[PDB]
Write a protein that binds this DNA or RNA. Structure first.
Lengths: 203, 77, 682, 80
RNA sequence: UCUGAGAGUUUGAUCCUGGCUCAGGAUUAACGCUGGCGGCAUGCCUAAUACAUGCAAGUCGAUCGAAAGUAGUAAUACUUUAGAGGCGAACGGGUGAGUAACACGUAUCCAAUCUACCUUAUAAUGGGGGAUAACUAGUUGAAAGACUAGCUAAUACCGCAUAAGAACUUUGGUUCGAAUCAAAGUUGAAAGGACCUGCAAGGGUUCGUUAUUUGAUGAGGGUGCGCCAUAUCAGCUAGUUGGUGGGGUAACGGCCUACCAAGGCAAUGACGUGUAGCUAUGCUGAGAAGUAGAAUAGCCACAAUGGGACUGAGACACGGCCCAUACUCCUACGGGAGGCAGCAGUAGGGAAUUUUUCACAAUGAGCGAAAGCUUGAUGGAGCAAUGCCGCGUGAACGAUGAAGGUCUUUAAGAUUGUAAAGUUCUUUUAUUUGGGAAGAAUGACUUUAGCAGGUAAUGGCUAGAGUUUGACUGUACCAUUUUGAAUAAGUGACGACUAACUAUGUGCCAGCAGUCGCGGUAAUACAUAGGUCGCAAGCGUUAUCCGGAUUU
C-alpha cells in the first residue's frame, strides 16, 4: 500500500530497516519481536517455506513501497526485455521514480518520495509527472521544479542527502542525474530475487 | 425514415406499363416469326430487338441467345 | 410572446351524484372548440356509449384540458374522480387561478360539497357559486342560499335569477344585464338577451339595489354613485366582484343547469370576466428555500419555478410528471435543478396531457399546467428550475391514512404484484400507506374511504392487472392464564449423540404485574448451578408461544424447586426439552384466556348525528354512557374493540352521511369477552 | 479519424464506395495520423496511379498533400 | 533463448490401482460488503416477443412545365414546390431463428457469366411526332380520396435518318468443346442545361447524352480438399439417373418442358436424428491442442411470416410493393393503415448490463456545375468500481508502548503503539482566478499570377491572400492561480493443506468446511471481543475453460 500506516509495526514483525537504524529507533523499544496477542515471548504456530518466501518478498516491497497491481505490471514489463533478468528486476525496482528521488537525497523516505512526486514537486523531461511508476535510464536529468525549493525540509535534506556512486547530484541546486546502472552488492542482501521469481504462481 | 419512397414507385408504375407494352409488341413479332420464317421478318426482328434491348428490358446476352435461336432456324430456309 | 390576461387556468369542482362528471364533461363539450379536444364534432361523428361511474371517472380524471372563449382560454383540471377527496382538491386549488364550484341540489345535505368549499375558503381561493340540479324537484335558488347561510353563514351575494320552479325553470335572468333567453336546447349554444318584462324588471332593479350596494363598500366610485344614485358602469361592478372574490368579502351566486345544459355561454362570459387571471391577481406566493422560508410572489417573469403535483405511470414511456408552472418558461431538453434531491434532472420532453389525448409542446409559459417525460428521480414535493431562480416549497395541507385494512394475499405472486402495484400507486397517490404485518402477514393498506379504496383496487386491477379478493383484519388477542399445580416435566429419549434424561419441577405463575422472575432454591444439592441457566433460557424462549393460537404467554414467573439427572448421560439439552414439554402441558391444563387492546374513539359530531352515534355504537355492543363538549363541538368517548372498528369506519361514515371524524389510539389491554373466546376451541 | 477515443488515426487505404470504412478494402495506400498536420503521412505513390487510372476516385482529404508532392502534375502527363 | 511446480485424502501399520479435491488465468458474469478519481475499454450471454415518439437518407430549380411570394406601373429576375423527370432506394445498420452446407477459406476453371455509373479511348451529341403528371372544374366525403373532362413542358415518352465501332449471318484465313482476320447481309445513337464569343450565323468552355474502346470493380456459377455429435440411424432418391429437341438464366446446367431409356448414391454411411450463422479469431496451456467465437473484420442467410412481381447495373428490398396467414390500431363502422432483428426507450422475462444522449465539428456515403443539402452511419457526451492502468485518504520528527481497550487474565508487562498527543512541512485532488488548445484549417468558395488545347473569350491546373466550418470546450493543458492535512478505506481468512491466533461462551446444539474434518462440557477448529496476516476502492462467492486434467 502507498500508505502503510504504522510501518514500524511491520519493522518489529519483519526486522528489515531502511537506512541503518531509523526503522528500529527504540521509540517505545527497539525490538524484532512479533506484536499482537499471539505471543511476545514465543513465535507463531504456523510455519512454512512459502511463508519465509513471502516474508522476504513483503520485506523488500515494504522497503520499496510497491503496490501489488503495480508490482505485477512491473513484473510483466520486466518479462518483456531479455538478458539476465534476475538482477535486472532489482535494478529496475531501484530505478523507480520514487526510488531514484530517494537515491538523490531529495526525500528521507519513499513514503515521503511519493508525497513529493504527487504534489507537483517532481518534474522530468519538462513533462509534469504525478505517477512514480517511471523507470529511470542512464544519463537522465532529474529536477525539483524549483517552485517548491523554498521548503526548509528539502533544503536540509539536499545538502546531507543519500549519495550513491551510480548517480550524481548537486546538494545545493536540487538537480541530479541518473548516470549508470547500480550493482547488486552495494544494495542490501537480506532478500532473495529467486524467492519472488519462483513465488510467481500467477503466471 | 425514407423521404422519397412513393416517388420512384409512381414514377416507375407508368414505365412498367410501357415496358409491358413493348414486351408484348415484341412477343407478337416473335409469334409471327414462329408462324412464318423469312428474311424480312428477321430484319424487323433485328430492328425491334435493337430498339428494346437498348432499354433495360432485354439484356444483351439474352438478345444474343434469342437471335442465335432465330438465325439457326432461318438458315435452313 | 402571448397575452396573459387572456391566459387563465380554472377548474370545475362538484360533488359526485351532483353532476360532477356530467357538469365537467358537458362544459368541456360546449367550450371545446380547439383542435386538441374538439369534442363537439368528434362526438357528433361517432355513436354514443356509456361507462360505469368508476370507469367513466377513470376516463375523466384529467390534468390539463384546454377550452376557448371569446378572448380567454381555460385550462380545466379534473383530479377528483372520487366521491370527494382532500389531496386532489388541495393540489388543484394550489395549482389553479380561479374555480367554478357547483353545489349539490338533488340532495339537500350536500355531504361532500362542503369539503371543497372549506378547502377553498381556508386558502382564500376565488370561486363562484353555481347550481346545476335546478332541473329536478326539491331545489330552489332561495332555498339553497337560505340553507347555506343557515348552515355555514358564508355571506354570499345572489346574482342570477331563475324563471319558474324546479320543473318550471326554463329561463335565466342576469342581474348585471338584462334577461337572457335561450334559443336552443342541448349544449346551450344559442342564447340571446331580451329586454326584461315588467313583472320581473323591477325585481332585478330591486336586486340591483342590493348587489351593487354589496359591492359599494370597498370602492370609492361605487359608493359615490350609489349615494348619488347614478348608474354605475357594469365594468366597475364586475371589477368589484373580482375584488371580492379575490378579497374574500362576499360570494356571487349563479343559477342554471348543466344536466339539461341551460345557461352555458353566459357562464363562459362570467368566468372570463370575474374570474381572476394570474396577472390580474398577486401571483403565486410561495416560501423560498433560503433557510427562512420567506413568502414571495412568482410575479410571472422570465425566471421559471414550479412544483410537481402529479406523477403517473404509463407504458412505453415510464413516468409522466404533471407539473404546474408558477413563473417563467421551461424548455424541452434542459437541465433542471432539484435542491432537495440536490441534483440536475435531465428533462427529455414536455407534453400537455388531456382527457383523451396528449400533445407534445416545446414551451410552457408561467401559470400553465403541463407534464414532463424525463426527470426519473424527482419525487413528491420537490422543486425544479431551469432558469436558476430561488426554488420554493408550498403544501398547505396533508392527510392521515388512518383507515386501515388487512387483506389476506391469495397467492405469493399475487402479493408480489400487489407490492409492485402499490409501490407505483404510492407514486400516483402517496397519502396511503402499505405494509406487510409481522403480526398476521396480511397486506396492510391504509387509506381514507370506501370509494377511495374501491377505486384503488380498481386501478391496481385495471392498469397493474392485480386481481385479488378481499381479506379480513384480525387482532392478535394475546394470551394469559391462571395458576398451575407446580409443573411436572419429564424428558427421556436416546438421542443427541447420547441418551437424554431429565426430570424438572418448577412453579410457573402468570401475573400481569411482574414478568419473568427466576428463583433458585437448591440447598441439598439436587441440581448443579450448570443447569440453572439452561432451564432459565428454555423457559424464557418457550414463553413466546401459547396453546390457544400460539400467542405469547407473557408476565409469568418461574421458581425452580426440584430436578433430577442421570449418570454420565443426560447432557444439557435434556433439561431444556423437559422444560418445554412442562410449559406446553401447563399452558394446556390451565384453560388460558385472551386479551385484546380496547381503544378510545373520540367521535366528533355537533349533536347532528348523536342518536345515530348511539345506534352505531350499540350495533357493536358498544359503550354509550353520555356526552361531553370540546370548546366548539360535542365529542363522545367510546371504548371499542379493534377488530370491529374496520367495518365501523364505514358504518359511522354511512349513518352520519360523511359528517363525522374520530381518532383511534391504544387505550388499554382488556381480557377478551367469551363472545370472542368461543371461537378458539377446536 | 478512427481508433482510440480522441486519438486520430486514418489509414490511407483503397476502399470502394460499397462497403463501410474499416471494413473491406482493396489495398493499403499508406497511413496518416490526423493528430498534428505537418505533412506527416506514409505513402507509396505507386499504386495511387493505378487507382487514378481505373476510376473509383480516392478520398478528398488528401488533395492538398498530392498537390504539394506534385502528384497531380505527374499524373496529367499520362493524359498528354 | 526455448518444452512441464505440486499437495491432501481408505488400512491396526505399510506399498499399489484408483477416484474426489485444491493451489493459475479470462469473464456481453451477477451479486454481497460497501464505495475517490480519471485515461482506457467494456457493457441483454437472457422473449428472430410486440412496439406509441423522433431520429433512423435522402438529393437535384444552371433537368422541366406550373403557381404562390419577393422586387419591379408593367415587361421581367429570383426563393419554394403541388409535380414531372434524374439519382440515391439492393447501400447502410442490426439480428443469428432457420440453415452441418460449396456457409467458409482453399487452388481455382469460368472453350458458360453481368457490372449503369467512374476510368483509357474510339465515334458523336441529327431530324420528327404525340403526350400526362401539375393545374382547374364536378360527384362524393372528416380526410381518405378515386372517378369524369380540358389544358400543358422537358435532358420525360414512341417513330425516322446516318452511323466510325458493335451483334447477327455466308464465303475466305485460325486454337488445343473456341477464337483471331478479309469482304459482304440485316439492324439499331443522344438532348439538351448553362457559360463565353460571334451583328446575326455559328463557333468555342463545362456537364450530360449515345454507341464503342480500355479496363477496374464486385457479384454469380463449377470444382480439389477439409470443415459438429450421431449404428440405441442399412437401405434410400424419384427430374430421381443417362441421353435427345425446344425454351429459360448475366451465364453452363433435370434449370424447365416434351420424348426415349433405367438408374444414382451408400458399408470410407446414404438417409434420419439433436445442435450450430462459417471463417479469421478470443481465452487457457509449454506446446500439440482444448474451449469459445463479448468488443473487430470478411463472407453468407432473413428482413411479422408464406407465396409473387415491377423498377433499376444492382431485390423479390428493416423501414418499397401485390396477395394470403397471423398481429396492432384508427375509422363516419362504410373502409383501411402499420409492423424498430435501425438508435434509444418501453411491455414482459431474466439475477442482471447504462441515457426515450449532442453535433453532423471531423470522416464517409448519397445527391448536387456550384450556395451546399440528409446522415441514431460517423464522430462525441453521460451512466455502471465492470475490467486494465495510474492515483488521493498525507509526509519527516515525535516514548522506553501517552490515556483507555485486549491479552497477561497472577495485577510484573506487552499489544494496540511513532500509530497517539504534539512539532515541522505539503497541496495532485478538495478549493481561488484567468488564459486556453490540437483536432479543422483538411475541404470547398472568392479575389489573384501564369500554364496548356483554345481564342473573340469564357472556363479547369498549381503558388499564396482572404471567406469560413466545434456537440465537443466552460475541454486537455498551462499559469509563486487563493485557502487548506485539510476532501475520502473498506475488506477475505487466521485447525492442516495455505501468508494469520489469544481469551471466553457454546456442549455432536447453536454451527462451520475448496479437501480432510471439528462441536456430546479445555474446539489451534463453532460463535463472539481483540489482534493478526492478504488485498485494496476493492474485497470476496458461485457457473464458466484450460496447465493438475497423462483422470482416454
Amino acid at each position: 500500500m502507498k500508505y502503510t500506516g504504522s510501518i514500524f509495526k511491520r519493522s518489529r514483525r519483519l526486522g528489515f530497516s531502511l537506512l541503518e537504524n531509523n526503522k528500529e529507533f527504540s521509540k517505545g523499544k527497539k525490538r524484532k519481536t512479533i506484536p499482537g496477542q499471539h505471543g511476545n515471548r514465543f513465535r507463531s504456530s504456523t510455519m512454512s517455506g512459502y511463508a519465509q518466501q513471502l516474508q522476504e518478498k513483503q520485506r523488500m516491497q515494504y522497503m520499496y513501497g510497491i503496490t501489488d497491481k503495480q508490482f505485477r505490471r512491473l513484473f510483466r514489463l520486466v518479462l518483456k526485455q531479455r538478458g539476465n533478468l534476475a538482477v535486472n528486476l532489482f535494478r529496475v525496482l531501484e530505478s523507480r521514480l520514487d526510488n531514484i528521488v530517494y537515491r538523490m537525497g531529495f526525500a528521507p523516505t519513499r513514503r515521503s518520495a511519493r508525497q513529493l512526486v504527487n504534489h507537483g514537486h517532481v518534474l522530468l523531461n519538462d513533462r509534469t509527472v504525478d505517477t512514480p511508476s517511471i523507470i529511470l535510464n542512464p544519463g537522465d536529468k532529474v529536477r525539483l521544479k524549483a517552485k517548491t525549493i523554498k521548503i526548509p525540509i528539502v533544503k536540509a535534506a539536499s545538502e546531507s542527502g543519500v549519495v550513491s556512486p551510480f548517480v550524481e547530484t548537486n546538494n545545493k541546486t536540487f538537480e541530479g542525474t541518473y548516470v549508470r546502472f547500480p550493482e547488486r552488492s552495494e544494495l542490501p542482501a537480506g532478500i532473495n530475487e529467486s524467492y519472488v521469481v519462483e513465488w510467481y504462481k500467477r503466471l | 425514415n425514407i423521404k422519397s419512397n412513393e416517388k420512384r414507385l409512381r414514377q416507375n408504375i407508368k414505365r412498367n406499363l410501357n415496358n409491358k407494352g413493348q414486351k408484348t409488341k415484341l412477343k407478337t413479332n416473335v409469334k409471327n416469326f414462329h408462324k412464318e420464317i423469312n428474311l424480312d421478318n428477321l430484319g424487323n426482328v433485328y430492328s425491334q430487338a435493337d430498339r428494346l434491348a437498348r432499354k433495360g428490358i432485354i439484356s444483351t446476352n439474352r438478345a444474343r441467345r434469342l437471335k442465335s435461336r432465330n438465325v439457326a432456324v432461318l438458315n435452313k430456309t | 410572446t402571448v397575452d396573459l390576461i387572456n391566459f387563465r387556468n380554472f377548474g370545475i369542482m362538484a360533488h359526485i351524484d351532483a353532476g360532477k362528471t356530467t357538469t365537467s364533461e358537458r362544459i368541456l363539450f360546449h367550450s371545446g372548440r380547439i383542435h386538441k379536444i374538439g369534442e363537439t364534432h368528434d362526438g357528433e361523428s361517432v355513436m354514443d356509449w356509456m361507462e360505469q361511474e368508476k370507469e367513466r371517472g377513470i376516463t375523466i380524471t384529467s390534468a390539463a384540458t384546454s377550452v376557448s372563449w371569446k378572448n380567454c382560454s381555460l385550462n380545466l383540471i379534473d383530479t377528483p374522480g372520487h366521491v370527494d377527496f382532500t389531496v386532489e382538491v388541495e393540489r388543484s386549488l394550489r395549482v389553479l387561478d380561479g374555480a367554478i364550484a357547483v353545489l349539490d341540489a338533488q340532495m339537500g345535505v350536500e355531504p361532500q360539497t362542503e369539503t371543497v368549499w372549506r378547502q377553498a375558503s381556508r386558502y382564500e381561493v376565488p370561486r363562484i357559486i353555481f347550481v346545476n340540479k335546478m332541473d329536478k324537484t326539491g331545489a330552489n335558488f332561495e332555498r339553497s342560499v337560505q340553507s347555506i347561510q343557515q348552515r355555514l353563514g358564508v355571506k354570499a351575494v345572489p346574482i342570477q335569477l331563475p324563471i319558474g320552479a324546479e320543473n318550471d325553470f326554463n329561463g335565466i335572468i342576469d342581474l348585471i344585464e338584462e334577461k337572457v333567453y335561450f334559443f336552443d336546447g342541448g349544449k346551450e349554444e344559442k342564447a340571446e338577451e331580451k329586454p326584461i318584462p315588467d313583472q320581473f324588471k323591477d325585481q332585478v332593479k330591486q336586486m340591483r339595489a342590493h348587489l351593487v350596494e354589496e359591492v359599494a363598500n370597498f370602492d370609492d366610485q361605487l359608493m359615490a354613485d350609489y349615494l348619488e344614485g347614478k348608474e354605475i358602469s357594469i365594468a366597475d361592478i364586475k371589477r368589484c366582484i373580482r375584488k371580492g372574490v379575490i378579497g374574500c368579502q362576499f360570494f356571487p351566486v349563479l343559477c342554471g343547469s348543466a344536466f339539461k345544459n341551460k345557461g352555458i355561454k353566459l357562464l363562459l362570459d362570467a368566468v372570463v370576466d370575474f374570474l381572476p387571471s394570474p396577472v390580474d391577481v398577486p401571483q403565486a406566493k410561495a416560501y423560498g428555500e433560503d433557510g427562512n422560508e420567506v413568502l414571495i410572489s412568482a410575479s410571472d417573469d422570465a425566471p421559471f419555478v414550479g412544483l410537481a403535483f402529479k406523477v403517473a405511470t404509463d407504458p412505453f414511456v415510464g413516468r409522466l410528471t404533471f407539473v404546474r408552472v408558477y413563473s417563467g418558461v421551461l424548455k424541452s431538453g434542459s437541465y433542471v435543478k432539484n435542491v432537495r434531491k440536490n441534483k440536475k434532472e435531465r428533462v427529455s420532453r414536455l407534453v400537455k396531457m388531456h382527457a383523451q389525448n396528449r400533445n407534445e409542446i416545446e414551451e410552457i409559459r408561467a401559470g400553465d399546467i403541463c407534464a414532463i417525460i424525463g426527470l426519473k428521480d424527482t419525487t413528491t414535493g420537490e422543486t425544479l428550475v431551469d432558469d436558476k431562480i430561488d426554488v420554493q416549497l408550498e403544501a398547505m395541507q396533508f392527510a392521515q391514512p388512518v383507515i386501515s385494512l388487512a387483506v389476506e394475499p391469495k397467492t405469493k405472486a399475487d402479493q408480489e404484484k400487489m407490492s409492485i402495484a402499490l409501490s407505483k400507486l404510492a407514486e400516483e397517490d402517496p397519502t396511503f400507506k402499505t405494509f406487510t404485518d409481522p403480526e398476521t402477514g396480511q397486506t396492510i393498506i391504509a387509506g381514507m374511504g370506501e370509494l377511495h379504496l374501491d377505486i384503488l383496487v380498481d386501478r391496481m386491477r385495471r392498469e397493474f392487472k392485480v386481481e385479488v379478493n378481499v381479506g379480513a383484519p384480525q387482532v392478535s388477542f394475546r394470551e394469559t392464564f391462571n395458576k398451575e399445580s407446580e409443573v411436572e416435566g419429564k424428558y427421556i429419549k436416546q438421542s443427541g449423540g447420547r441418551g437424554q434424561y431429565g426430570h424438572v419441577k418448577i412453579r410457573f405463575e402468570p401475573n400481569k404485574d411482574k414478568g419473568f422472575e427466576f428463583v433458585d432454591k437448591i440447598v441439598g444439592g439436587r441440581i448443579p448451578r450448570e443447569y440453572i441457566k439452561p432451564v432459565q433460557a428454555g423457559l424464557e424462549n418457550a414463553m413466546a408461544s401459547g396453546p390457544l393460537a400460539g400467542y405469547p404467554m407473557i408476565d409469568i414467573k418461574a421458581t425452580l424447586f426440584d430436578g433430577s439427572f442421570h449418570e454420565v448421560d443426560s447432557s444439557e439439552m435434556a433439561f431444556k426439552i423437559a422444560a418445554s414439554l412442562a410449559l406446553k402441558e401447563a399452558g394446556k391444563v390451565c384453560s388460558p384466556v385472551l386479551l385484546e387492546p380496547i381503544m378510545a374513539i373520540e367521535v366528533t359530531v355537533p349533536e347532528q348525528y348523536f342518536g345515530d352515534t348511539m345506534g352505531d355504537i350499540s350495533s357493536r355492543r358498544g359503550l354509550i354512557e353520555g356526552t361531553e363538549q370540546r370548546d366548539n363541538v360535542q365529542v363522545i368517548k367510546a371504548k371499542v374493540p379493534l377488530k370491529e372498528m374496520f367495518g365501523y369506519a364505514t358504518d359511522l361514515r354511512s349513518f352520519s352521511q360523511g359528517r363525522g371524524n374520530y381518532v383511534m389510539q391504544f387505550s388499554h389491554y382488556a381480557e377478551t369477552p367469551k363472545s370472542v373466546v368461543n371461537e378458539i376451541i377446536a | 479519424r478512427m481508433g482510440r477515443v480522441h486519438y486520430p488515426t486514418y489509414r490511407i487505404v483503397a476502399v470502394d464506395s460499397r462497403v463501410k470504412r474499416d471494413g473491406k478494402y482493396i489495398a493499403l495506400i499508406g497511413h496518416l495520423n490526423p493528430a498534428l498536420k505537418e505533412n506527416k503521412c506514409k505513402i507509396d505513390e505507386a499504386v495511387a496511379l493505378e487507382w487514378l487510372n481505373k476510376g473509383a476516385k480516392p478520398t478528398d482529404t488528401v488533395r492538398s498533400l498530392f498537390s504539394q508532392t506534385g502528384l497531380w502534375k505527374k499524373f496529367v502527363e499520362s493524359k498528354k
